[PDB]
Design a protein around this ligand. Structure first.
Ligand code: LMN
Ligand code: PTY
Lengths: 88, 75
């Protein structure tokens, strides 16, 4: 039992940049086609591929940190959908 | 009528929009290069007509020379 935490004095309580939509993890950079529409509220982390005609809507999180995530041609992921990948 | 300037401008705008479409981009992506394409198309069409006239004149002169050379066979 601890019941003790140490607040950080350099922690940021308001990021003027907001949340970055494309979050590369090391060498994994999400690839978004120029034809595809990704809402500004969407977060794409890790290796996530969005193809032509695809669309990702508000509040959706596509975390491809563990394994690959792919969204096909003219396939859409609608509002506030969490798409995640596991190791196996 | 249909002048070389307008057909050239339409071809330039069309090739700009065609290039934009071929890259999955919106048609009117960069308007400034659309204007540049219209200007270049007009210039190229006018130059093509100006070159065609001179080319036909040169061909007429050269065929006159060839016919004159052939006509000497009968002497
Ligand atoms: C692919 C598109 C299809 C469009 C074609 C069909 C649509 C009709 C428009 C065809 C068009 C543009 C050609 C567009 C080129 C395409 C662009 C290429 C890519 C660009 C991105 C040419 O069409 C005319 O051109 C004539 C040639 O002058 C030709 O007549 C023959 O010529 C004799 C040869 O010597 C033959 O012996 C004889 O049999 C015919 O008399 C014919 O080709 C035709 O009558 C329109 O004419 C345009 O050119 C000339 C007129 O001449 C006009 O300016 C001229 O300038 C001086 C001359 O330099 C003159 O001093 C001046 O007086 C005159 O004002 C222009 O204002 C405009 O009118
Ligand atoms: C003939 C039938 C009628 C057809 C219609 C003709 C109409 C007249 C022509 C209209 C052309 C409209 C073009 C508008 C201007 C846009 C040019 C911007 C190009 C530019 O900014 O330079 C960089 C690329 O250069 C380039 O893109 C230069 C590309 C040039 C390719 C050809 C070079 C000449 C070859 C000789 C002719 C072809 C063979 C003929 C026998 C851009 O770079 P970026 O930002 O996009 O990113 C890196 C990509 N590299």
């Amino acid at each position: 039992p601890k019941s003790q935490v140490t607040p950080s004095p350099d922690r940021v309580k308001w990021d003027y940049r907001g949340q970055r939509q494309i979050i590369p993890l090391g060498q994994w950079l999400p690839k978004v086609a120029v034809d595809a529409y990704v809402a500004p509220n969407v977060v794409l982390a890790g290796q996530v591929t969005v193809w032509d005609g695809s669309s990702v809507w508000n509040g959706a999180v596509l975390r491809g940190d563990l394994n690959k995530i792919t969204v096909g041609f003219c396939s859409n992921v609608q509002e506030r959908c969490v798409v995640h990948a596991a190791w196996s | 009528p249909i002048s070389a300037t307008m057909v050239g401008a339409l071809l330039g705008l069309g090739t700009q929009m065609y290039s934009n479409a071929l890259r999955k981009l919106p048609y009117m992506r960069h308007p400034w290069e659309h204007v540049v394409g219209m200007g270049l198309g007009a210039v190229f069409a006018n130059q093509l007509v100006k070159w065609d006239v001179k080319l036909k004149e040169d061909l007429d002169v050269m065929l006159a020379k060839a016919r004159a050379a052939n006509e000497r066979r009968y002497f």
